[PDB]
């Protein structure tokens, strides 16, 4: 823009406006390529973690009823889920939220502020998702406190399984060694091998 108006040489008249416009457009393409992806990444990871705390609460709501199958994990629409491991995955999302908030602060320098001024959104979509996240983390914690206690018994079950199966493995390995070097019926060459 600061590039001078069409300057004419002494010999003939001259203009630069098409080049000026095309360079403006080129750097505008640069700006667009930079902006779109950053808005997308920050907003998507925020909506992701919001929904993640949602489904966390919903999962913590299922098991509190004491049953033998609920002593184990849960199975729903091809997804497998323990209570304790989810009590653990909750702080992981809580931790990603902070880096995401810094990223949204950076995004609050191009496009979240274009929203704040242009469309007059009093609350941006990311910050709305963030407030909802706070509420749902609270509710998650409330249901989380009740079913903190979990599968000591099932860990013991795993151990017992490993034991029994190793013992039968050992007996079968002894039989493996017995029948391993052709100590069986040997009538002919193909027979003893087969």
Query: What are 95's two structure tokens?
Result: 């931790």
The answer to whether 57 and 139 have CB atoms below 8 angstroms apart is yes
Residue at token pair 């209570």: 83
> First vs last Cα of the chain: how many Å apart?
88
Helix axes 84-107, 125-146, angle to 10 degrees: 160
- Closest to 130 (Cα-Cα) out of 99, 101, 108, 105: 101
Helix axes 17-60, 125-146, angle to 10 degrees: 20
DSSP 116: I
DSSP letter for each residue of 64-122: TS--HHHHS-EEETTEEE-SHHHHHHHHHHHHHHHHHHHHHHHHTTTHHHHIIIII--S
**CA pair distance 99, 72, nearest whole angstrom:** 34
For the chain, the farthest-separated pair of C-alpha atoms sits apart, in whole angstroms, at 113
Residue 45: enclosing H or E segment and its boundaries? helix 17-60
**CA pair distance 34, 167, nearest whole angstrom:** 62
**CA pair distance 20, 149, nearest whole angstrom:** 69
The answer to whether 82 and 151 have CB atoms below 8 angstroms apart is yes
> What distance lies between CA 16 and its chain's CA centroid?
51
**CA pair distance 43, 36, nearest whole angstrom:** 11
- Closest to 149 (Cα-Cα) out of 87, 74, 79, 81: 87
Cα–Cα distances in Å, from 28 out to 34, 62, 95? 10, 51, 35
Residue 39: enclosing H or E segment and its boundaries? helix 17-60
**CA pair distance 129, 90, nearest whole angstrom:** 16
- Closest to 111 (Cα-Cα) out of 99, 101, 125: 125
If one counts every other C-beta atom within 10 angstroms of the C-beta of residue 34, the result is: 10
Residue 145: enclosing H or E segment and its boundaries? helix 125-146
**CA pair distance 106, 120, nearest whole angstrom:** 19
Resolution of this structure in Å? 8.0
The answer to whether 110 and 42 have CB atoms below 8 angstroms apart is no
Residue at token pair 């909506």: 47
The answer to whether 109 and 23 have CB atoms below 8 angstroms apart is no
The answer to whether 55 and 137 have CB atoms below 8 angstroms apart is no
């Amino acid at each position: 823009s600061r590039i001078k108006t069409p300057e004419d040489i002494s010999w003939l008249r001259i203009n630069l406006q098409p080049m000026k416009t095309a360079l403006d457009a080129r750097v505008t393409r640069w700006i667009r390529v930079y902006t779109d992806f950053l808005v997308n990444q920050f907003r998507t990871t925020q909506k992701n973690l919001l929904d993640f705390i949602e489904k966390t609460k919903d999962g913590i709501k299922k098991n509190p009823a004491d049953h033998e199958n609920l002593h184990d994990k849960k199975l729903l629409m091809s997804v497998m889920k323990v209570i304790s491991d989810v009590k653990d995955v909750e702080p992981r999302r809580e931790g990603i939220i902070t880096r995401m908030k810094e990223m949204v602060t950076k995004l609050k320098k191009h496009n979240v502020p274009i929203t704040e001024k242009g469309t007059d959104d009093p609350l941006q979509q990311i910050d709305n998702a963030n407030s909802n996240f706070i509420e749902i983390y609270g509710r998650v914690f409330k249901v989380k406190a009740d079913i903190i206690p979990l599968q000591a018994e099932e860990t013991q079950n795993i151990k017992r399984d490993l034991d029994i199966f190793m013992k039968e493995v050992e007996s079968f390995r002894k039989e493996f060694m017995q029948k391993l070097p052709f100590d069986y019926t040997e009538s002919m060459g193909y027979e003893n091998i087969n």
